Design a binder for this molecule. Structure first.
Ligand SMILES: CC(C)c1ccc(Cc2sc(N)nc2C(=O)O)cc1
Ligand SMILES: [Zn+2]
Ligand SMILES: [Zn+2]
Length: 267
């Protein structure tokens, strides 16, 4: 008895995933996700780029916000990812089915996306989402040019093996503005030392702290806005108190060092 779509009961907090209207970050860069999850739209004369989508259920809201910005399903050309977890790559598969968009990702993020976040290094099969295929594989430092906007990939392995920062230069009030979309640097509940699924985890995190610190970075944004002290609901004040790349990296490294001290302490 009971149809398959009725066998599951998902936990849902009304406060999660509050929709918002497009919030302008620079002349061609908008936040079009929710108050609590970043999804960046970059509009160019040669099509639009979307960096992350948030949770699987966010597809229709993303498309509504795209329409409001004048971006039709045919105009969405490129999807880029911070890391391929359910709360950031959730709606990618559906977006691909409903638009012209294609996915560029590094090999690690591509394999994780293609298996829908299953067999996660730390969370097993508890965070699975609709799988999607990558259309282009990128290497570290590779650049993708869309309508004269140049995006560069900076690998920062740790939170996932394929964690990536993307940097591009927009304009704001005439001047160029160097935007850095830096992935998470958290290790939440992770076994850091002697982890058989990730033997060099600590060394990778250490290098990614240094990579983030050194990013070309007039404006830092992060997949979880709280992580860089953005407040997307605050309208034109949303970025007032945003961390620098240095400070974001420094805070992450201090938390990480604290977790590692706790894991390493005797019982
Ligand atoms: C202190 C505990 C509650 C905690 C704080 C911060 C995180 C980080 C999280 S959560 C989530 N869904 N994603 C992330 C991420 O880094 O992408 C995870 C756990
Ligand atoms: Zn994650
Ligand atoms: Zn997350």
């Amino acid at each position: 008895e009971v149809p398959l779509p009725q066998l599951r009961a998902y936990t849902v907090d009304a406060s999660w995933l509050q929709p918002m209207a497009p919030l302008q970050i620079a002349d061609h860069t908008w936040q079009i996700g929710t108050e609590d999850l970043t999804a960046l739209l970059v509009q160019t004369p040669d099509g639009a780029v979307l960096l992350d989508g948030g949770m699987p259920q966010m597809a229709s809201h993303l498309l509504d916000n795209m329409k409001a910005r004048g971006v039709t399903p045919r105009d969405l050309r490129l999807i880029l990812l911070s890391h391929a977890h359910a709360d950031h790559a959730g709606p990618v598969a559906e977006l691909k089915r409903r638009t012209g968009a294609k996915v560029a990702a590094n090999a690690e993020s591509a394999v994780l996306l293609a298996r829908g976040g299953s067999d996660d290094l730390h969370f097993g099969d508890g965070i699975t989402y609709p799988p999607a295929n990558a259309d282009r594989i990128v290497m570290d430092g590779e650049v993708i040019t869309v309508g004269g906007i140049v995006f560069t990939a900076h690998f920062m392995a740790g939170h996932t093996p394929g964690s990536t920062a993307w940097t591009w230069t927009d304009t704001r009030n005439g001047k160029p503005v160097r935007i850095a979309y830096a992935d998470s640097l958290s290790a939440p509940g992770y076994q850091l030392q002697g982890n058989p699924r990730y033997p060099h985890l600590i060394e990778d995190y250490r290098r990614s702290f240094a990579t983030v610190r050194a990013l070309p970075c007039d404006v830092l944004l992060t997949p979880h806005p709280g992580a860089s002290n953005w407040d997307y609901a605050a309208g034109a004040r949303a970025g007032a108190k945003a961390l620098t790349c240095k400070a974001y990296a420094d805070a992450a490294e201090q938390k990480f060092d604290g977790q590692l001290a706790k894991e390493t302490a005797g019982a």
